[PDB]
Amino acid sequence: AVQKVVVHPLVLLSVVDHFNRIGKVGNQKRVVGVLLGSWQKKVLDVSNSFAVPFDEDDKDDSVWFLDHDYLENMYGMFKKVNARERIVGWYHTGPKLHKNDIAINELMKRYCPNSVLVIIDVKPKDLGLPTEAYISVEEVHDDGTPTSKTFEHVTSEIGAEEAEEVGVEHLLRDIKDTTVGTLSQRITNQVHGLKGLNSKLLDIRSYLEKVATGKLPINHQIIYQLQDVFNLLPDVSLQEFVKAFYLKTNDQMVVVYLASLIRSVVALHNLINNKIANRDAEKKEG
Amino acid sequence: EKKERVEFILEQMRLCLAVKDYIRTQIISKKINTKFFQEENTEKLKLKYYNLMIQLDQHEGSYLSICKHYRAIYDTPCIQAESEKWQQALKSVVLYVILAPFDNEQSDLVHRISGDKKLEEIPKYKDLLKLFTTMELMRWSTLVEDYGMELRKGSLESPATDVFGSTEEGEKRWKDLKNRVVEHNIRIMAKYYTRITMKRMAQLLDLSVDESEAFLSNLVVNKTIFAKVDRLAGIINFQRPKDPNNLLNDWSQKLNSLMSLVNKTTHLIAKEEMIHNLQ
Amino acid sequence: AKAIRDGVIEASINHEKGYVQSKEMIDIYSTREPQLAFHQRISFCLDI
Amino acid sequence: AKLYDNLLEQNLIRVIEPFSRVQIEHISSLIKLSKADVERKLSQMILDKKFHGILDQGEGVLIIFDEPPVDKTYEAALETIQNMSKVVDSLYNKAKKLT
Amino acid sequence: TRPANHRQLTFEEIAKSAKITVNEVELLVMKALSVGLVKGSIDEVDKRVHMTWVQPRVLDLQQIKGMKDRLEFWCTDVKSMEMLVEHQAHDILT
Numbered sequence: 001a002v003q004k005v006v007v008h009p010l011v012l013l014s015v016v017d018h019f020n021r022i023g024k025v026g027n028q029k030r031v032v033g034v035l036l037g038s039w040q041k042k043v044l045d046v047s048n049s050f051a052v053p054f055d056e057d058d059k060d061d062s063v064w065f066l067d068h069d070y071l072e073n074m075y076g077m078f079k080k081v082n083a084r085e086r087i088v089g090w091y092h093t094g095p096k097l098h099k100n101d102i103a104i105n106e107l108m109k110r111y112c113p114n115s116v117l118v119i120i121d122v123k124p125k126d127l128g129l130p131t132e133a134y135i136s137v138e139e140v141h142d143d144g145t146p147t148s149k150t151f152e153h154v155t156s157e158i159g160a161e162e163a164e165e166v167g168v169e170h171l172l173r174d175i176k177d178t179t180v181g182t183l184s185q186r187i188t189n190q191v192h193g194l195k196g197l198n199s200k201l202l203d204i205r206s207y208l209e210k211v212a213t214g215k216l217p218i219n220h221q222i223i224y225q226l227q228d229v230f231n232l233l234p235d236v237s238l239q240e241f242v243k244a245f246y247l248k249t250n251d252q253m254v255v256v257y258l259a260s261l262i263r264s265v266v267a268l269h270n271l272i273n274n275k276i277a278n279r280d281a282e283k284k285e286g
Numbered sequence: 287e288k289k290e291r292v293e294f295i296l297e298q299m300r301l302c303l304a305v306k307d308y309i310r311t312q313i314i315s316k317k318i319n320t321k322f323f324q325e326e327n328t329e330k331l332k333l334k335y336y337n338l339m340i341q342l343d344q345h346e347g348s349y350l351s352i353c354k355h356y357r358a359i360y361d362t363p364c365i366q367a368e369s370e371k372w373q374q375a376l377k378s379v380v381l382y383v384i385l386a387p388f389d390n391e392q393s394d395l396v397h398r399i400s401g402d403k404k405l406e407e408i409p410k411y412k413d414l415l416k417l418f419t420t421m422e423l424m425r426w427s428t429l430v431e432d433y434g435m436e437l438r439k440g441s442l443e444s445p446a447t448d449v450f451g452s453t454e455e456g457e458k459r460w461k462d463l464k465n466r467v468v469e470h471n472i473r474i475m476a477k478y479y480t481r482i483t484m485k486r487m488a489q490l491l492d493l494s495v496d497e498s499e500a501f502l503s504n505l506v507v508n509k510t511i512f513a514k515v516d517r518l519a520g521i522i523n524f525q526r527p528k529d530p531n532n533l534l535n536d537w538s539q540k541l542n543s544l545m546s547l548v549n550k551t552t553h554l555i556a557k558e559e560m561i562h563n564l565q
Numbered sequence: 566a567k568a569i570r571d572g573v574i575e576a577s578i579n580h581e582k583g584y585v586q587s588k589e590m591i592d593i594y595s596t597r598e599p600q601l602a603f604h605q606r607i608s609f610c611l612d613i
Numbered sequence: 614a615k616l617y618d619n620l621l622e623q624n625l626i627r628v629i630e631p632f633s634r635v636q637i638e639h640i641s642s643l644i645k646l647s648k649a650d651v652e653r654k655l656s657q658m659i660l661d662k663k664f665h666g667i668l669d670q671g672e673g674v675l676i677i678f679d680e681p682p683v684d685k686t687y688e689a690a691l692e693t694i695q696n697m698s699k700v701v702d703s704l705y706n707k708a709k710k711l712t
Numbered sequence: 713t714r715p716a717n718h719r720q721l722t723f724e725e726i727a728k729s730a731k732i733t734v735n736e737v738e739l740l741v742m743k744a745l746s747v748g749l750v751k752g753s754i755d756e757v758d759k760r761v762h763m764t765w766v767q768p769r770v771l772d773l774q775q776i777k778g779m780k781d782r783l784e785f786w787c788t789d790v791k792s793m794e795m796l797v798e799h800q801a802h803d804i805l806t
Contacts, residue, residue: 096560204552207559232543232544234537244531
């Protein structure tokens with residue numbers, strides 16, 4: 001249904017500054033607010049947002065309130081200043097999936113059909129992209145409850161924009177691993193990539209924590225993919241993999257050989273262009 | 287004028303059939319196959335335009351130009367309430383989907399005739415399309431003993447008498463039905479059969495090794511079924527190319543499927559932890 | 566016999582009969598020798 | 614006559630197609646022709662290289678095999694070599710003469 | 713049960729383990745490939761079939777031991793192959 005989401009740096013900071021402006025509460029407050037934007041060509045977009053006044057008590061943590069008058073007036077001001085901009089869903093600050101974040105979506109689903117939530121990060125650290133979005137799916141199914149509803153994570157990324165990149169690259173001024181050559185991919189995905197595979201190997205190990213000791217439901221819907229992985233582990237080295245592999249390596253290194261074969265001659269020509277700049281300058285000038 | 291000029295100009299094509307002249311018949315029918323958006327009172331007239339279009343498509347080999355012809359004589363709003371004359375309309379709507387040549391138009395045409403409530407009132411002809419839908423067919427002699435007899439039976443005998451009665455066009459339907467049943471073997475034989483002997487296949491076609499080579503020949507020079515036969519060891523095989531690049535190529539395909547697959551579980555585990563170890 | 570022993574030629578002698586058979590060894594390309602014939606010269610050509 | 618050569622060979626590529634090997638005695642039967650002129654004519658196919666394969670004299674098994682070889686990769690890198698050799702020959706004309 | 717080393721059974725082995733004759737096991741497995749529980753190719757002349765994909769079943773707390781162990785040294789192959797990347801690819805980018 002929904003392919004993926006588009007998140008901007010403007011909404012990205014536009015949550016964090018609100019976490020700063022309610023950061024004086026000290027004890028506990030989650031930044032929940034209203035997520036604005038479009039979705040076009042089956043691609044979710046997030047352009048604007050604001051935050052709603054919200055409080056919560058730990059005793060009886062099934063009670064939430066959104067001042068929907070404040071939702072009406074300010075979004076009326078936002079449709080007014082920008083008729084193109086509209087609602088796209090909501091968000092909460094999302095450390096660890098708080099429990100009112102099952103009906104916050106069912107509370108305000110009367111505005112957006114796919115009333116999407118976004119989990120953000122307040123203390124930014126990972127080896128990946130700490131931006132999360134779920135989606136609401138419900139099920140009269142299998143065996144958990146006759147009324148069952150659990151969010152499912154749609155893939156999430158930071159959408160860029162030509163307007164905002166002036167501010168992005170303007171406000172970086174720190175470091176930027178450009179000069180995309182033979183080593184950009186080496187570090188963005190060959191150094192960072194295998195350590196990308198590290199945590200994905202680690203998460204199935206975190207599920208493996210229930211061999212006899214973990215939570216009481218066992219598998220049901222985990223083990224078809226698990227059997228599928230070790231079923232679909234790739235082909236071993238006995239056939240033409242090493243052959244045709246040696247064939248195609250044995251063809252790629254031809255092109256490498258030609259490129260290195262030119263490059264030396266080019267730089268040699270350049271040195272001759274220097275010795276003309278030396279020998280007929282030493283006698284001329286002195 | 288919408289009706290009377292059309293009634294005038296569709297007359298003389300059967301006169302061209304009395305000439306045995308199809309090259310004129312299709313040109314003067316080219317005037318009227320673009321004559322539509324008049325389906326209000328013309329009950330029998332467009333049906334006469336179709337029944338003078340049974341033969342222009344019936345004569346030479348055109349067993350797939352009769353597709354929209356025969357569903358077009360399923361189309362007409364009168365036919366629905368003359369059930370036994372509509373039973374032979376259930377006949378003509380099935381006596382071509384076999385008979386049409388192998389096509390994507392045939393392979394979704396089985397779905398265009400499939401999923402019908404009032405066609406499956408004949409208990410045989412849901413099974414007939416079921417046979418060419420599903421897996422391996424019971425040769426030909428184990429088939430004609432089960433279905434070469436119901437063509438005389440039922441309330442449906444008349445386009446089956448267009449299969450029976452003419453022994454020459456009818457014989458072309460014995461050998462085109464025979465073409466579909468001898469071909470229906472060869473499709474899934476090439477699909478699942480890596481390397482089979484020649485005698486085993488001539489035995490599963492119930493005929494000679496020589497005529498079996500005639501069957502495999504005109505399809506591999508049609509190159510619609512690629513095969514590398516043998517006439518010294520009888521060891522034939524299907525879809526056996528040299529494959530320099532598809533080994534590592536499809537291996538890379540297995541890599542991408544694998545990385546998608548290991549990506550599939552990773553975002554699925556974390557919510558499974560958070561539904562019993564949330565709070 | 567020592568031409569077999571020291572490397573050079575591989576295949577067998579029917580010492581009883583007397584013919585020395587030799588097998589047809591082709592496709593030395595997918596045998597990874599010319600990758601080494603490259604990599605000797607890849608590295609050196611980068612060096613020059 | 615010349616049309617009969619192309620028709621003869623049109624049949625001759627037609628029946629030879631679906632297999633890898635056969636004896637000459639079956640293709641002589643299947644085109645309904647002799648074996649000597651068919652053997653010589655098949656030899657002329659693999660002399661003129663219009664058809665390629667091999668033939669046998671012991672019983673006449675025609676071994677048919679085809680793959681399109683990699684050609685673009687090596688020679689197109691090979692003529693760049695003889696370009697650049699001439700370029701180094703020109704480097705005499707600005708390098709050896711000059712400094 | 714057969715590992716991914718071979719998983720290549722023969723029609724004599726089906727004729728032993730299912731005691732059904734030589735001329736019906738192919739009609740059995742064409743039906744099996746039509747249904748789609750198993751995914752493998754059929755050779756007739758070497759009397760063997762190359763079965764590749766099996767329908768996934770369920771399992772107790774004992775198969776997770778073997779899947780855990782085949783996972784465990786598969787971690788350190790990623791550690792080991794990555795270690796050359798960190799060591800040799802150290803000076804390309806600090």
